[model samples]
Target: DHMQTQEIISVTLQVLSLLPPYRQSISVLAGSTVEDVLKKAHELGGFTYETQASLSGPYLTSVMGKAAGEREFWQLLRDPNTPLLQGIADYRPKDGETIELRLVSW
Candidate 1:
């Protein structure tokens, strides 16, 4: 017999550079990735996003109906000043941690 329990974790997702900024707290399974959190946020009417297929994985192309320009892109951070080293689909955030999606230009 197979027996396992799934744990639910709570994380906060925040968007930067949108007027007054947007923030939302969501609950997800422990193994869920950042992409999953974004999807959940979208479901809750937080914002919209788009991704592009890439060799590494699906890359974030836009957020909140705003697409990245030639010199601009969406950046993911662990709040404050930490930058996430992995892509959204590959990064699994910890409980109580705050994730930020910032739009920046090069």
Candidate 2:
């Protein structure tokens, strides 16, 4: 029964800091996927975030009140080249690995 549980993992989340221009880094526990870290950050920091159920997976709408739509919402990257093929819900971040959530438009 205990073996059926998921192991907790450490993760770092990079998001746009509320200071207006700079970004912020927060350390969190990855209970399963990247989603868990985000949730934990929200709980600890009271930072507002929103996601929607999609056909593929969870679609991030806004983070810290940064809305998407007029342009690109947010992009998740690991290697800093391209966005992740799998959404945050499905992407399991590695320990000590830094995941970037850049707010961009194109």
Candidate 3:
């Protein structure tokens, strides 16, 4: 069980709330890319994605029945001032590192 315990990492999922400055957290396994973590979240329940090439990747439209607005989009961040420009499939987070996905408006 060496690999099982060693490779397992804790990832926090934070979805921005409507009231501003409010959010929630859900822990997931940090294996492979950030996309994998998302898949894990979906499997746990109350999560879905919308496919659209124009959006760069599958857009997170709804979480726990809360839908995103037309002008709103998801923003991926790790550490301060660091934005993930590429899709979630390409981003790999370190062990114990926090990966944040925010629903923001332009």
Candidate 4:
């Protein structure tokens, strides 16, 4: 499999959270502008946008502040409160397919 041996789920918004009561989305991912991808997130296992209300408990925060990096990106993956943003959307991608969606100032 040419895959990274792991699924690379793309989430929008930088640093701050997208769901309600988070930090208020500051910016959206550059190329996540897709509609169907969100439909796919539901097909796969999904999650709430932000399981945590705020930075109250143990959560992953980008050391770079906003830029998505190995560490910054992993924070979203590492957080139980914050699962893949796709979880919030009732969608899913084709099996072994790439799902592309965006998170803008919504």
Candidate 5:
């Protein structure tokens, strides 16, 4: 099967919250999307999250049991100051990349 030959990559998932941010290193298949990493992160980190369906795809609506308020929402970012425009399912993370899930309000 192709599964035996699939390459695995490691990436970091950072969750920003009112308390100290939670960080975890997750290893997934090379072509695994952000959603896949999040799923793995959830199992290792013991955090919770929710997503909403949109025309583009599923978008994060809540994290750590905290839902988005009126103008607040969860934002996905790559390392420093790079904001990801694509949804988790479409964004495939590369090895050694740090993906941040920040809760913000406007």
Candidate 6:
């Protein structure tokens, strides 16, 4: 099955169901940059990437990607608008594992 960030995965899949076949995906991996992941998600299910780290799974609610390194930790903190008082698990991908996402744009 296609994978998404835990909190947004289900919403992501649901969004996929509304798009055309050319815009639907079967699988996606984690650990990719916010930009890469967002692009891939759009190709699969029309998700948008913004400057804000907090994306609507594939799409973003605010512009976060446009920012410089500040947007690097998009998933690290849930509060895209501001810093999070609590911490989040921001783990990168392991070796040999590629940061790939299935695209429906094909």
Listed in order, each prediction's TM-score against the native is: 0.91, 0.74, 0.62, 0.19, 0.88, 0.25
lDDT by residue (tens digit), candidate 5, 29-65: 9999998988887887676788889887888888777
Please write out the lDDT profile of model 3 over residues 1-106, one tens digit for every residue.
3553545666665554443432323455545677777777677775555534454665456544456688876677875647877667778777666666677788
Runs in model 6 deviating more than 4 A are: 1-31, 52-106
Candidate 2 structure lDDT: 0.70
Worst lDDT window (10 residues) for model 6? 8-17
Candidate 2 error regions (>4 Å): 1-7, 21-31, 79-82
Clashes (N, CA, C under 3 Å) per candidate: 0, 0, 0, 14, 0, 9
Q: Quantify how close model 6 is to the true structure by its C-alpha RMSD in Å.
A: 13.6
Q: Total backbone clashes of model 3? A: 0
Q: Sort all candidates by lDDT, best to worst.
A: 1, 5, 2, 3, 6, 4
Q: CA shift at 34, candidate 2, in angstroms? A: 1.2
What would the per-residue lDDT of candidate 2 be over residues 1-106, giving only the tens digit for each residue? 3555544556656664345542335554454676776777787775667899999789888877877768777788774555787887988777766676778789
Q: After superposition, how far is residue 28 of candidate 5 from its true place, in Å?
A: 0.6
Q: Residue 105 deviation, candidate 3, in Å?
A: 1.3
Q: Would you list the rank order by TM-score, best first?
A: 1, 5, 2, 3, 6, 4
lDDT of 1 by residue, 15-104 (tens): 876877888998999989999999999898867899999999989998888899999989999976699999999999999989998898
Best candidate according to TM-score: 1
User: Which pairs clash (backbone N, Cα, C closer than 3 Å) in model 2?
Assistant: none
Q: Which digits, one per residue and each the tens of the lDDT, describe model 4 over residues 1-106?
A: 5754444444432223333322112122333322333323323433222222343432322222233334333232212233444432223323332322222221
Best of the two (1, 3) by lDDT: 1
Error of 2 at 42 (Å): 0.7
Question: Over all chains combined, what TM-score does candidate 4 have?
Answer: 0.19
Error of 1 at 45 (Å): 2.1
Off by over 4 Å in 4: 1-33, 47-106
Clashing residue pairs, candidate 3?
none
Error of 6 at 71 (Å): 16
Candidate 4 CA-lDDT value:
0.30
Of candidate 4, the 10-residue stretch with the lowest lDDT total is 20-29
